[PDB]
Write a protein that holds these residues in place. Structure first.
Motif, short mmCIF file in Angstrom:
data_model
loop_
_atom_site.label_atom_id
_atom_site.label_comp_id
_atom_site.label_asym_id
_atom_site.label_seq_id
_atom_site.Cartn_x
_atom_site.Cartn_y
_atom_site.Cartn_z
N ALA A 89 8.78 -42.81 21.78
CA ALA A 89 7.61 -41.96 21.70
C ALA A 89 7.39 -41.23 23.04
N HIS A 90 7.38 -41.98 24.13
CA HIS A 90 7.27 -41.37 25.47
C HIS A 90 8.33 -40.30 25.66
N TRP A 91 9.58 -40.64 25.34
CA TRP A 91 10.73 -39.73 25.49
C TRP A 91 10.54 -38.45 24.69
N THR A 142 -2.82 -46.03 26.74
CA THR A 142 -2.44 -47.41 26.51
C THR A 142 -0.95 -47.68 26.70
N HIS A 143 -0.17 -46.65 27.04
CA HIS A 143 1.28 -46.83 27.20
C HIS A 143 1.63 -47.52 28.48
N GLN A 144 2.55 -48.50 28.42
CA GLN A 144 3.18 -49.06 29.60
C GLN A 144 4.65 -48.72 29.54
N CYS A 145 5.18 -48.07 30.57
CA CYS A 145 6.58 -47.77 30.57
C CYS A 145 7.31 -49.09 30.61
N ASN A 146 8.32 -49.19 29.75
CA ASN A 146 9.05 -50.45 29.57
C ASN A 146 10.45 -50.31 30.17
N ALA A 147 11.29 -51.32 30.02
CA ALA A 147 12.65 -51.24 30.60
C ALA A 147 13.47 -50.06 30.05
N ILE A 148 13.18 -49.63 28.83
CA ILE A 148 13.94 -48.51 28.25
C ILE A 148 13.45 -47.20 28.89
N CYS A 149 12.13 -47.04 29.01
CA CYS A 149 11.54 -45.91 29.77
C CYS A 149 12.14 -45.83 31.17
N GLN A 150 12.18 -46.97 31.86
CA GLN A 150 12.68 -47.05 33.24
C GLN A 150 14.14 -46.63 33.32
N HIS A 173 14.42 -43.09 33.20
CA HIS A 173 13.73 -42.38 34.28
C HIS A 173 12.74 -41.38 33.75
N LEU A 174 11.96 -41.77 32.75
CA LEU A 174 10.98 -40.85 32.14
C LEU A 174 9.81 -40.59 33.10
N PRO A 175 9.53 -39.32 33.35
CA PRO A 175 8.32 -39.04 34.09
C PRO A 175 7.08 -39.46 33.27
ZN LIG Z 1 7.20 -44.90 29.07
#
Ligand SMILES: [Zn+2]
Length: 263
Positions: free
Chosen positions: A177-179, A235-243, A246-248
């Motif tokens: 979703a973030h991506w 409410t989003h927490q960037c997770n290991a996949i986000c990290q 390297h999602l801004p």
């Molecule tokens: Zn994220």
């Protein structure tokens, strides 16, 4: 009870290219491929909800499918929003899966339209939106939505307003979703992520799409525009996949990163 129904399956030719263009420019899809087809359809709906009826069917290539329709008449352009949304989600998940940042693969169910027809002369032809309107009108019926049949335990993982299912948390879905927002340069976010988990695979249906352009998805009740985007990120927490991607981060993000779930 069942009968045979013959007519046209209506899809979008060169999806990837059409969708890439729709996202980048501001030009709606204006090309629709008609393919003749015969279904065996149940007369009685097996389910209803989310404002619409559902009928079991067999596509004659033997596959189990579901035919859906709103309770009463709707203009083609409204129904096409559902199709354009689904095609965006498929486009995005396909790229996302190709990044191979997770063992879990996301598959949105194809969505297409079906209209009954006594004739098959449009078989294999590509029509404009206006020509599609005329083919629909000639039928004088609201097209059905068609999607492959999906069995299993259905879960709503993320809604369209910042809510998160806790017990069935999957970091792959949240990072997706973030991506989506990152990939579309801030213009939209995919949420209402919901469906069936089996074998490192999510079979997803009826997603929501928030778009910052107030004129882009005008009929969709689930599109909350920039507010829905903000709600997701609050409410989003960037997770290991986000990290790993390297999602801004969205400027509304305030919560710390987490590393529960996949990777
Ligand atoms: Zn994220």
């Amino acid at each position: 009870y069942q009968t045979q129904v013959s007519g046209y399956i209506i899809t979008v030719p060169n999806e990837t290219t059409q969708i890439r263009k729709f996202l980048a420019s501001n030009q709606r899809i204006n090309q629709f491929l008609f393919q003749h087809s015969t279904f065996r359809v149940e007369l009685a709906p097996f389910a209803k909800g989310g404002e619409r009826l559902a009928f079991r069917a067999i596509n004659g290539r033997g596959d189990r499918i579901v035919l859906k329709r709103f309770f009463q008449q709707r203009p083609l352009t409204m129904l096409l929003e559902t199709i354009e949304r689904q095609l965006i989600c498929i486009y995005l998940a396909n790229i996302f899966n190709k990044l191979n940042v997770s063992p879990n693969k996301l598959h949105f169910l194809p969505n297409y339209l079906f209209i009954p027809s006594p004739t098959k002369d449009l078989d294999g032809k590509i029509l404009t939106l206006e020509q599609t309107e005329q083919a629909v009108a000639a039928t004088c019926r609201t097209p059905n939505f068609v999607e492959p049949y999906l069995s299993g335990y259905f879960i709503k993982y993320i809604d369209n307003n910042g809510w998160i299912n806790e017990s069935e948390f999957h970091s792959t879905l949240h990072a997706f979703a973030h991506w989506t927002w990152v990939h579309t340069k801030g213009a939209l976010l995919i949420c209402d992520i919901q469906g069936v988990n089996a074998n490192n695979k999510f079979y997803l249906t009826d997603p929501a799409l928030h778009h910052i352009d107030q004129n882009k998805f005008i009929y969709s009740e689930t599109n909350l525009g920039e507010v829905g985007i903000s709600q997701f990120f609050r409410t989003h927490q960037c997770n290991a996949i986000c990290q790993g991607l390297h999602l801004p981060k969205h400027k509304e993000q305030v919560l710390p990163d987490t590393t529960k779930g996949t990777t």
